[PDB]
Amino acid sequence: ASKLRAVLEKLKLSRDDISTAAGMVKGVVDHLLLRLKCDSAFRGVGLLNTGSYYEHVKISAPNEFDVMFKLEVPRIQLEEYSNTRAYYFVKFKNPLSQFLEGEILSASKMLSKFRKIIKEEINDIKDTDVIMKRKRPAVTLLISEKISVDITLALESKSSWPASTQEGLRIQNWLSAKVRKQLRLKPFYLVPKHEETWRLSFSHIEKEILNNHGKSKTCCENKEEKCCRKDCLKLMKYLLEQLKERFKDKKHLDKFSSYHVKTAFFHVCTQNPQDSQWDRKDLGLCFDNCVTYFLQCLRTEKLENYFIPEFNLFSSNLIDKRSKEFLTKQIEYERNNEFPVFD
Numbered sequence: 001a002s003k004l005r006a007v008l009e010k011l012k013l014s015r016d017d018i019s020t021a022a023g024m025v026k027g028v029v030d031h032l033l034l035r036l037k038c039d040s041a042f043r044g045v046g047l048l049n050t051g052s053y054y055e056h057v058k059i060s061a062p063n064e065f066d067v068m069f070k071l072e073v074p075r076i077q078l079e080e081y082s083n084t085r086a087y088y089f090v091k092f093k094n095p096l097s098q099f100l101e102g103e104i105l106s107a108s109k110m111l112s113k114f115r116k117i118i119k120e121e122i123n124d125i126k127d128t129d130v131i132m133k134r135k136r137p138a139v140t141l142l143i144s145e146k147i148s149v150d151i152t153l154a155l156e157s158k159s160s161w162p163a164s165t166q167e168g169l170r171i172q173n174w175l176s177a178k179v180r181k182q183l184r185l186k187p188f189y190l191v192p193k194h195e196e197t198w199r200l201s202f203s204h205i206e207k208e209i210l211n212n213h214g215k216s217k218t219c220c221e222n223k224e225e226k227c228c229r230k231d232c233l234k235l236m237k238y239l240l241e242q243l244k245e246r247f248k249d250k251k252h253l254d255k256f257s258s259y260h261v262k263t264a265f266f267h268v269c270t271q272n273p274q275d276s277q278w279d280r281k282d283l284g285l286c287f288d289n290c291v292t293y294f295l296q297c298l299r300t301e302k303l304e305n306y307f308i309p310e311f312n313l314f315s316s317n318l319i320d321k322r323s324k325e326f327l328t329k330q331i332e333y334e335r336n337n338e339f340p341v342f343d
Protein backbone atom coordinates (compact mmCIF):
# COMPACT_ATOMS: atom_id res chain seq x y z
CA ALA A 1 0.00 0.00 0.00
CA SER A 2 3.07 2.09 0.48
CA LYS A 3 3.96 0.95 -3.06
CA LEU A 4 0.53 1.79 -4.53
CA ARG A 5 0.77 5.44 -3.53
CA ALA A 6 4.16 5.46 -5.22
CA VAL A 7 2.47 4.36 -8.43
CA LEU A 8 -0.37 6.87 -8.07
CA GLU A 9 2.26 9.57 -7.46
CA LYS A 10 4.09 8.57 -10.67
CA LEU A 11 0.97 8.75 -12.85
CA LYS A 12 0.21 12.25 -11.58
CA LEU A 13 3.63 13.79 -12.31
CA SER A 14 2.96 12.71 -15.97
CA ARG A 15 -0.71 13.70 -16.17
CA ASP A 16 0.22 17.14 -14.86
CA ASP A 17 3.25 18.61 -16.49
CA ILE A 18 3.32 20.79 -19.58
CA SER A 19 2.69 19.21 -23.00
CA THR A 20 1.71 20.86 -26.30
CA ALA A 21 -0.55 17.93 -27.28
CA ALA A 22 -3.72 19.74 -26.19
CA GLY A 23 -3.12 22.59 -28.64
CA MET A 24 -2.47 20.28 -31.59
CA VAL A 25 -5.56 18.19 -30.76
CA LYS A 26 -7.68 21.28 -30.09
CA GLY A 27 -6.67 22.84 -33.41
CA VAL A 28 -7.58 19.73 -35.40
CA VAL A 29 -10.87 18.96 -33.66
CA ASP A 30 -12.36 22.42 -34.20
CA HIS A 31 -11.41 22.35 -37.89
CA LEU A 32 -13.22 19.03 -38.19
CA LEU A 33 -16.21 20.25 -36.17
CA LEU A 34 -16.68 23.18 -38.58
CA ARG A 35 -16.31 21.33 -41.89
CA LEU A 36 -18.59 18.70 -40.28
CA LYS A 37 -21.29 21.27 -39.45
CA CYS A 38 -20.84 22.37 -43.07
CA ASP A 39 -22.62 19.21 -44.27
CA SER A 40 -26.34 18.82 -43.67
CA ALA A 41 -26.37 15.24 -42.35
CA PHE A 42 -23.94 16.35 -39.64
CA ARG A 43 -25.13 19.92 -39.06
CA GLY A 44 -25.77 19.15 -35.38
CA VAL A 45 -22.44 17.42 -34.64
CA GLY A 46 -20.66 18.67 -31.53
CA LEU A 47 -18.31 17.69 -28.73
CA LEU A 48 -19.77 15.70 -25.86
CA ASN A 49 -18.15 18.19 -23.45
CA THR A 50 -16.76 21.50 -24.69
CA GLY A 51 -13.51 22.39 -23.00
CA SER A 52 -12.90 18.65 -22.69
CA TYR A 53 -10.89 18.12 -25.86
CA TYR A 54 -8.84 15.98 -23.40
CA GLU A 55 -10.16 12.56 -22.35
CA HIS A 56 -7.47 9.84 -22.08
CA VAL A 57 -8.70 6.26 -22.33
CA LYS A 58 -5.17 5.02 -21.64
CA ILE A 59 -3.88 6.24 -18.25
CA SER A 60 -0.28 5.14 -19.01
CA ALA A 61 0.33 6.56 -22.51
CA PRO A 62 -0.73 10.23 -22.33
CA ASN A 63 -0.16 10.81 -26.04
CA GLU A 64 -3.30 8.83 -27.02
CA PHE A 65 -6.42 11.06 -26.86
CA ASP A 66 -10.04 10.10 -27.40
CA VAL A 67 -12.90 12.48 -28.14
CA MET A 68 -16.53 11.83 -29.01
CA PHE A 69 -18.82 13.76 -31.36
CA LYS A 70 -22.54 13.84 -30.60
CA LEU A 71 -25.35 14.40 -33.08
CA GLU A 72 -28.91 14.61 -31.77
CA VAL A 73 -31.52 12.41 -33.46
CA PRO A 74 -35.03 13.67 -32.55
CA ARG A 75 -37.99 11.32 -32.61
CA ILE A 76 -35.85 8.21 -32.44
CA GLN A 77 -37.54 4.79 -32.55
CA LEU A 78 -35.46 2.00 -30.98
CA GLU A 79 -35.84 -1.76 -31.48
CA GLU A 80 -33.94 -4.31 -29.40
CA TYR A 81 -32.01 -6.79 -31.56
CA SER A 82 -32.42 -10.53 -30.96
CA ASN A 83 -33.18 -10.38 -27.19
CA THR A 84 -29.67 -9.09 -26.47
CA ARG A 85 -30.95 -6.36 -24.08
CA ALA A 86 -27.89 -4.26 -25.03
CA TYR A 87 -27.97 -3.88 -28.84
CA TYR A 88 -30.63 -2.10 -30.94
CA PHE A 89 -31.80 -1.05 -34.42
CA VAL A 90 -32.22 2.72 -34.88
CA LYS A 91 -35.40 3.88 -36.63
CA PHE A 92 -37.29 7.10 -37.25
CA LYS A 93 -40.80 8.62 -37.48
CA ASN A 94 -34.92 13.81 -41.66
CA PRO A 95 -31.28 14.80 -42.30
CA LEU A 96 -29.98 11.25 -41.88
CA SER A 97 -32.25 10.04 -44.73
CA GLN A 98 -29.29 9.49 -47.11
CA PHE A 99 -28.01 6.79 -44.67
CA LEU A 100 -31.07 4.54 -44.24
CA GLU A 101 -31.82 1.01 -45.53
CA GLY A 102 -35.58 0.85 -45.36
CA GLU A 103 -36.75 1.87 -41.88
CA ILE A 104 -33.31 1.07 -40.35
CA LEU A 105 -30.36 3.46 -39.85
CA SER A 106 -27.09 2.15 -41.32
CA ALA A 107 -23.99 2.84 -39.25
CA SER A 108 -21.69 1.69 -42.07
CA LYS A 109 -23.04 4.22 -44.55
CA MET A 110 -22.99 6.87 -41.83
CA LEU A 111 -19.44 6.31 -40.66
CA SER A 112 -18.35 6.04 -44.30
CA LYS A 113 -19.39 9.66 -44.90
CA PHE A 114 -18.14 10.67 -41.48
CA ARG A 115 -14.77 9.24 -42.50
CA LYS A 116 -14.59 10.62 -46.06
CA ILE A 117 -15.41 14.16 -44.88
CA ILE A 118 -12.68 13.85 -42.25
CA LYS A 119 -10.13 12.48 -44.73
CA GLU A 120 -10.75 15.64 -46.80
CA GLU A 121 -10.41 18.39 -44.19
CA ILE A 122 -7.17 16.89 -42.89
CA ASN A 123 -5.10 18.11 -45.86
CA ASP A 124 -6.45 21.62 -45.43
CA ILE A 125 -3.78 21.59 -42.68
CA LYS A 126 -0.31 22.56 -43.85
CA ASP A 127 0.10 23.75 -40.24
CA THR A 128 0.39 20.22 -38.84
CA ASP A 129 0.84 16.94 -40.69
CA VAL A 130 -2.21 14.77 -39.99
CA ILE A 131 -2.87 11.19 -41.11
CA MET A 132 -5.90 8.91 -40.89
CA LYS A 133 -5.49 5.18 -40.29
CA ARG A 134 -7.65 2.40 -41.66
CA LYS A 135 -9.69 0.63 -38.99
CA ARG A 136 -10.09 -3.02 -37.91
CA PRO A 137 -13.28 4.06 -32.32
CA ALA A 138 -14.63 5.02 -35.73
CA VAL A 139 -11.70 7.17 -36.93
CA THR A 140 -8.12 7.53 -35.69
CA LEU A 141 -5.82 10.41 -36.60
CA LEU A 142 -2.07 10.55 -36.12
CA ILE A 143 -1.05 14.17 -35.51
CA SER A 144 2.57 15.01 -36.33
CA GLU A 145 4.22 11.76 -35.19
CA LYS A 146 3.57 11.32 -31.47
CA ILE A 147 -0.07 12.26 -30.83
CA SER A 148 -3.08 10.17 -31.89
CA VAL A 149 -6.79 11.01 -31.55
CA ASP A 150 -9.63 8.45 -31.53
CA ILE A 151 -12.85 10.07 -32.83
CA THR A 152 -16.24 8.50 -32.09
CA LEU A 153 -19.62 9.51 -33.50
CA ALA A 154 -22.64 8.97 -31.24
CA LEU A 155 -26.34 9.49 -31.77
CA GLU A 156 -27.95 11.48 -28.96
CA SER A 157 -31.52 11.11 -27.72
CA LYS A 158 -33.13 13.42 -25.19
CA SER A 159 -35.99 11.01 -24.58
CA SER A 160 -35.75 8.81 -21.53
CA TRP A 161 -33.45 5.81 -21.38
CA PRO A 162 -34.40 2.52 -23.09
CA ALA A 163 -36.50 0.06 -21.11
CA SER A 164 -33.55 -2.27 -20.56
CA THR A 165 -31.98 0.26 -18.18
CA GLN A 166 -34.93 0.17 -15.74
CA GLU A 167 -33.55 -1.86 -12.84
CA GLY A 168 -30.06 -0.64 -13.75
CA LEU A 169 -27.75 1.89 -12.16
CA ARG A 170 -28.59 0.63 -8.69
CA ILE A 171 -26.93 3.57 -6.94
CA GLN A 172 -29.84 4.21 -4.55
CA ASN A 173 -27.95 3.16 -1.40
CA TRP A 174 -24.75 5.03 -2.31
CA LEU A 175 -25.38 8.19 -4.36
CA SER A 176 -29.17 8.28 -3.66
CA ALA A 177 -32.51 7.84 -5.40
CA LYS A 178 -32.96 11.52 -6.11
CA VAL A 179 -29.54 11.57 -7.83
CA ARG A 180 -30.35 8.46 -9.87
CA LYS A 181 -33.41 10.33 -11.17
CA GLN A 182 -31.39 13.41 -12.19
CA LEU A 183 -28.86 11.25 -14.01
CA ARG A 184 -31.57 9.33 -15.81
CA LEU A 185 -32.94 12.67 -17.07
CA LYS A 186 -29.65 13.13 -18.93
CA PRO A 187 -29.67 12.17 -22.62
CA PHE A 188 -28.38 8.77 -23.68
CA TYR A 189 -25.94 7.96 -26.51
CA LEU A 190 -25.80 5.14 -29.08
CA VAL A 191 -22.53 4.09 -30.79
CA PRO A 192 -22.17 1.33 -33.47
CA LYS A 193 -20.73 -2.19 -33.65
CA HIS A 194 -22.50 -5.55 -33.52
CA GLU A 195 -26.22 -6.22 -38.74
CA GLU A 196 -26.48 -2.42 -38.33
CA THR A 197 -26.90 -2.47 -34.55
CA TRP A 198 -26.08 0.20 -31.98
CA ARG A 199 -25.44 0.08 -28.24
CA LEU A 200 -25.68 2.57 -25.38
CA SER A 201 -22.73 4.69 -24.24
CA PHE A 202 -22.63 6.00 -20.66
CA SER A 203 -19.26 7.71 -20.47
CA HIS A 204 -21.12 10.89 -19.59
CA ILE A 205 -22.74 9.22 -16.57
CA GLU A 206 -19.51 7.58 -15.42
CA LYS A 207 -17.75 10.96 -15.52
CA GLU A 208 -20.45 12.62 -13.46
CA ILE A 209 -20.47 9.92 -10.80
CA LEU A 210 -16.69 10.17 -10.56
CA ASN A 211 -16.66 13.90 -9.96
CA ASN A 212 -19.32 13.49 -7.28
CA HIS A 213 -18.73 10.01 -5.90
CA GLY A 214 -19.35 9.84 -2.14
CA LYS A 215 -22.38 9.38 0.03
CA SER A 216 -21.18 12.53 1.75
CA LYS A 217 -21.73 15.65 -0.33
CA THR A 218 -18.32 16.90 0.94
CA CYS A 219 -16.39 13.72 0.07
CA CYS A 220 -12.83 14.70 -0.91
CA GLU A 221 -13.36 18.43 -0.20
CA ASN A 222 -11.24 18.38 3.00
CA LYS A 223 -8.50 16.42 4.78
CA GLU A 224 -10.96 14.77 7.22
CA GLU A 225 -12.92 12.98 4.43
CA LYS A 226 -10.47 12.09 1.70
CA CYS A 227 -11.43 8.73 0.19
CA CYS A 228 -9.79 6.42 -2.34
CA ARG A 229 -12.57 5.54 -4.76
CA LYS A 230 -10.84 7.19 -7.73
CA ASP A 231 -7.40 5.85 -6.76
CA CYS A 232 -8.78 2.30 -6.70
CA LEU A 233 -10.22 2.92 -10.16
CA LYS A 234 -6.96 4.24 -11.66
CA LEU A 235 -5.06 1.25 -10.24
CA MET A 236 -7.62 -1.23 -11.59
CA LYS A 237 -7.27 0.35 -15.05
CA TYR A 238 -3.48 0.61 -14.88
CA LEU A 239 -3.39 -3.08 -13.94
CA LEU A 240 -5.40 -4.06 -17.02
CA GLU A 241 -3.50 -1.69 -19.33
CA GLN A 242 -0.06 -2.84 -18.25
CA LEU A 243 -1.17 -6.47 -18.56
CA LYS A 244 -2.58 -5.78 -22.04
CA GLU A 245 0.70 -4.17 -23.02
CA ARG A 246 2.63 -7.21 -21.78
CA PHE A 247 0.70 -9.64 -23.97
CA LYS A 248 -0.05 -7.18 -26.76
CA ASP A 249 1.77 -9.79 -28.90
CA LYS A 250 -0.39 -12.79 -27.89
CA LYS A 251 -4.17 -12.61 -28.42
CA HIS A 252 -5.26 -13.57 -24.89
CA LEU A 253 -6.31 -10.18 -23.50
CA ASP A 254 -7.71 -8.63 -26.66
CA LYS A 255 -11.33 -9.07 -25.49
CA PHE A 256 -10.89 -6.87 -22.37
CA SER A 257 -11.21 -3.09 -22.21
CA SER A 258 -11.07 -0.35 -19.59
CA TYR A 259 -14.83 -0.71 -19.39
CA HIS A 260 -14.87 -4.17 -17.86
CA VAL A 261 -12.84 -2.65 -15.05
CA LYS A 262 -15.06 0.41 -14.59
CA THR A 263 -18.13 -1.86 -14.58
CA ALA A 264 -16.84 -4.12 -11.85
CA PHE A 265 -15.54 -1.11 -9.88
CA PHE A 266 -18.96 0.59 -9.68
CA HIS A 267 -20.43 -2.71 -8.43
CA VAL A 268 -18.09 -2.62 -5.44
CA CYS A 269 -19.09 1.02 -4.85
CA THR A 270 -22.66 -0.29 -4.65
CA GLN A 271 -21.62 -3.10 -2.28
CA ASN A 272 -19.68 -0.59 -0.18
CA PRO A 273 -21.76 2.61 -0.11
CA GLN A 274 -20.21 4.21 2.94
CA ASP A 275 -17.33 6.61 2.55
CA SER A 276 -16.07 5.02 5.79
CA GLN A 277 -15.36 1.91 3.69
CA TRP A 278 -12.99 3.85 1.40
CA ASP A 279 -10.88 5.80 3.89
CA ARG A 280 -7.74 7.09 2.18
CA LYS A 281 -5.70 5.05 4.70
CA ASP A 282 -7.26 1.71 3.70
CA LEU A 283 -6.14 2.07 0.09
CA GLY A 284 -4.34 -1.27 0.21
CA LEU A 285 -7.40 -3.13 1.49
CA CYS A 286 -9.89 -1.40 -0.81
CA PHE A 287 -7.75 -2.08 -3.86
CA ASP A 288 -7.40 -5.74 -2.87
CA ASN A 289 -11.17 -6.05 -2.51
CA CYS A 290 -11.51 -4.61 -6.00
CA VAL A 291 -8.97 -7.09 -7.32
CA THR A 292 -10.85 -9.86 -5.53
CA TYR A 293 -14.22 -8.84 -6.96
CA PHE A 294 -12.96 -8.55 -10.55
CA LEU A 295 -11.39 -12.01 -10.25
CA GLN A 296 -14.63 -13.39 -8.84
CA CYS A 297 -16.45 -12.16 -11.93
CA LEU A 298 -13.84 -13.82 -14.13
CA ARG A 299 -14.11 -17.24 -12.46
CA THR A 300 -17.90 -17.34 -12.26
CA GLU A 301 -18.28 -15.82 -15.76
CA LYS A 302 -20.74 -13.31 -14.36
CA LEU A 303 -20.37 -9.53 -14.43
CA GLU A 304 -23.61 -7.59 -14.84
CA ASN A 305 -23.49 -4.52 -17.04
CA TYR A 306 -23.95 -1.66 -14.60
CA PHE A 307 -26.79 -0.11 -16.56
CA ILE A 308 -28.45 -3.12 -18.21
CA PRO A 309 -28.38 -5.84 -15.52
CA GLU A 310 -29.66 -8.77 -17.64
CA PHE A 311 -26.52 -8.37 -19.81
CA ASN A 312 -23.47 -10.32 -18.73
CA LEU A 313 -20.17 -8.97 -20.10
CA PHE A 314 -18.45 -12.23 -19.10
CA SER A 315 -20.91 -14.81 -20.40
CA SER A 316 -19.25 -17.86 -21.91
CA ASN A 317 -20.33 -16.62 -25.36
CA LEU A 318 -18.99 -13.06 -25.09
CA ILE A 319 -15.53 -14.10 -23.84
CA ASP A 320 -14.44 -17.74 -23.74
CA LYS A 321 -13.32 -19.33 -20.48
CA ARG A 322 -9.80 -19.91 -21.79
CA SER A 323 -8.94 -16.20 -21.83
CA LYS A 324 -10.71 -15.46 -18.56
CA GLU A 325 -8.64 -18.19 -16.91
CA PHE A 326 -5.59 -16.44 -18.41
CA LEU A 327 -6.52 -13.00 -17.13
CA THR A 328 -7.03 -14.66 -13.77
CA LYS A 329 -3.53 -16.18 -13.99
CA GLN A 330 -1.70 -12.89 -14.39
CA ILE A 331 -3.66 -10.70 -11.97
CA GLU A 332 -3.51 -13.33 -9.24
CA TYR A 333 0.19 -13.64 -9.94
CA GLU A 334 0.57 -9.85 -9.74
CA ARG A 335 -1.38 -9.63 -6.49
CA ASN A 336 0.68 -12.39 -4.86
CA ASN A 337 3.88 -10.47 -5.75
CA GLU A 338 2.77 -6.88 -4.91
CA PHE A 339 2.16 -5.94 -8.55
CA PRO A 340 5.56 -5.81 -10.29
CA VAL A 341 3.83 -5.00 -13.58
CA PHE A 342 3.43 -1.47 -12.22
CA ASP A 343 7.08 -0.94 -13.33
Ligand SMILES: Cn1cc(-c2ccc(F)c(CNC(=O)c3cc(Br)ccc3O)c2)cn1
Nearest residue numbers: 086199200201202203206257259262263305
Ligand atom coordinates in the same frame (compact mmCIF):
# COMPACT_ATOMS: atom_id res chain seq x y z
C1 LIG B 1 -16.04 -0.22 -24.63
N1 LIG B 1 -17.28 -0.99 -24.77
C2 LIG B 1 -18.47 -0.73 -24.23
C3 LIG B 1 -19.32 -1.73 -24.63
C4 LIG B 1 -20.75 -1.85 -24.28
C5 LIG B 1 -21.52 -2.90 -24.76
C6 LIG B 1 -22.86 -3.00 -24.41
C7 LIG B 1 -23.40 -2.04 -23.60
F1 LIG B 1 -24.71 -2.12 -23.27
C8 LIG B 1 -22.68 -0.98 -23.10
C9 LIG B 1 -23.29 0.07 -22.22
N2 LIG B 1 -22.24 0.93 -21.71
C10 LIG B 1 -21.77 0.78 -20.48
O1 LIG B 1 -22.12 -0.16 -19.75
C11 LIG B 1 -20.81 1.81 -19.98
C12 LIG B 1 -20.41 1.60 -18.67
C13 LIG B 1 -19.51 2.47 -18.08
BR1 LIG B 1 -19.00 2.17 -16.28
C14 LIG B 1 -19.02 3.57 -18.75
C15 LIG B 1 -19.43 3.80 -20.05
C16 LIG B 1 -20.33 2.93 -20.68
O2 LIG B 1 -20.70 3.19 -21.96
C17 LIG B 1 -21.34 -0.89 -23.46
C18 LIG B 1 -18.53 -2.56 -25.42
N3 LIG B 1 -17.28 -2.12 -25.51
Ligand SMILES: [Zn+2]
Nearest residue numbers: 214219220227
Ligand atom coordinates in the same frame (compact mmCIF):
# COMPACT_ATOMS: atom_id res chain seq x y z
ZN1 LIG C 1 -14.18 10.75 -2.16
